[PDB]
Amino acid sequence: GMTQHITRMRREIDEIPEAVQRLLDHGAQDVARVAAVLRLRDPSFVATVARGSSDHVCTYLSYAAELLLGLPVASLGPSVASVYDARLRLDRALCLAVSQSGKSPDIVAMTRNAGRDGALCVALTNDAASPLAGVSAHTIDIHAGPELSVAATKTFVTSAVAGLMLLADWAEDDGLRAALGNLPETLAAASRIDWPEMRVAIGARPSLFTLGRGTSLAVSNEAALKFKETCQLHAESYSSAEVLHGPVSIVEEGFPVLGFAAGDAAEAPLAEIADQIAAKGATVFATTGRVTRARVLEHVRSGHALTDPLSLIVSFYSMVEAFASERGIDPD
Template identity: 70%
Template sequence: VKMTHAARRDGAHTIAITNDTASPLANEADRVLDIHAGPERSVAATKTFVTSAVAGLALYADWAGDDDLRAALLYLPAQLKLAAEIDWPELRESIGQRPSLFTTGRGPAWAISGEAALKFKETCQLHAESYSSAEILHGPISIVDAGFPVLSLAAGDAAEPGLVDVADRIAEMGAQVFVTSEMCRKARRIDYVRTGHPLTDPLALIVSFYSMVERLALDRGVDPDIPRHLRKVTETV
C-alpha cells in the first residue's frame, strides 16, 4: 500500500489487482481490477493466484493489442475446467512419502514452477525447489539419485524443446521425471491441456497441479487447507 502511495505521489498511474475492492490497496490506487475470485478460504491461495494472473494477462493483451491472447482468454474458463479434471496419479505415486523433489520450467512456465514448489511446501510439508531448465544442470542436479521426483512444466512455446531435452537428460540419470509435453524420449509424459496461447498454457498447468497436490497432501495425511505454522494473513516487519 505504501509503495502504491509513493508511486502515485510521484506521478505514476497505479492499478490494483485485488479480490477486495474495498481494501486499502484498492483505495490507494487510481484504478482497480476486481479479480472476482470469491472467498479464498484455504490458507494456501489458489483461486486468487490464477485469477490475478488472468487479470494481468487481460491488461497486457489490451495494452499490446494482442488479439490472439484476447481470444485465448475468452476460451480459458472452459480449458481450465478440463485442466482441473487432470490429477497426475503417476506423479503422486512417484512422490509418495519422499522428502524432496524438483520442479522445473522455462519462460512463463518457470513462474508456475515456482508456485508449484511453494504449494508442495505449504500443503504437503514436502521440500521442493524450483529451477529454470537452463540452470538445473549447474549444481542442483548433484542431489538427484535413483527415483528422485522431478516435475517439468512445459508450455507450448519456444522454450518447450529445450526444457524437454533437459528433462530427458535428468531421466537418464535415474530420476523419475514427469513432463507436460509430447516431445519427451526418456521422461514420462503426463496429461495436460493446451489453451491456444503460450501465455495462458501455464495457467492450465497450475490448475492441474492444484488438483494433484490436494490429493497428494491427503495421501500424506496433511490437511491442505490448514498448513501448519501458516496463517491467512501475515505481518511483514
C-alpha cells in the same frame, strides 16, 4: 452419506473455472477502461509490487509484458519505500501491484510511493475497498471470491488472468483474448487431471523439484511454494537451464522432478533438459509430448503460449490435493 468429504482446497479448485468466467464477464469493462488509459498514457516501462504467491503472478506477468509489448519490468522491493522511503524516477511507468487482500503495509507503501514518484498505479486485488485500492489510480477486482484454502488457488489463477486480460487489451491481441475467453473450458479440463504416477513417486520419495523455462518458471515457482504450504514437504523450483549447474545435484537427491512446459518457444529446451535428467536415472515427468525419456504428464493446451501455464498449475493443484487427501493430510 450427508457428511461431505471434500477438502476446502478441492472445493476451491473446482470453483476455478467459474471464478475465471466471472472475472471475464464482470471484469471486462474495468479491464478495457484501464487498457484504454494505458494506450493513451503509453508508458515505457513497468514496475511490479507484490509478495508471496502474488509475486509469482508478477513474474508471470513480467514475461507476458516483455513478450507482448517489449516493455521492461522491474520488480520493486517494498523496503525501498517502507524502510528507506527512497525517491524513485517513475514518470512514464505503469506500477502493477498484486495482492489478495490489499492490506500489506509494505505493498501499500511501495504502491503509494510509486504514485508519488510518477507512476500510473494499477492494483490487481480481491478487495476493491482495501488500503491498496485506496492508493492506486485504478483497481481491477480479480473476482476470486472468498478463499478458505491456504492453497489460495483461485487468487493465483484470477490474478494472473486479470493481468493477462489487461495486457491483451493493451496490446490489442486477438489470439490472446480468444485463449483467455476459452479458459473456463480449458481449466475445467485441467482440473480433471491429478497425475497418479507423480503421487506414487512423491509418496515414495517425499520432496519435489519443479522446473520451468521462460514464462512457465513463474508457475514452477508457484508450484514449489504451494506444495510446501499445503503438504509441509520440501520443494524447490529451478530454471531448467540452471538446474544442472546449481549447488546441489538434483539427480543425487533422488526426488521426483516435474517440468512445467507450455506450448511456447521454451517447450523444446525444457523437454531437452527433462530428458537429460531422466537419462541420469532420475524420476522425471514433464507437461509436454516432446520428451522421449522423461514421462509425459497429462495436460491441456490453452490456444496461446501465455495462457498455457495457467492450465498446468491447475493440474498441479489437483495433483497436490489428491496427494494430500489420500494420505490424510488436510492442507487446511
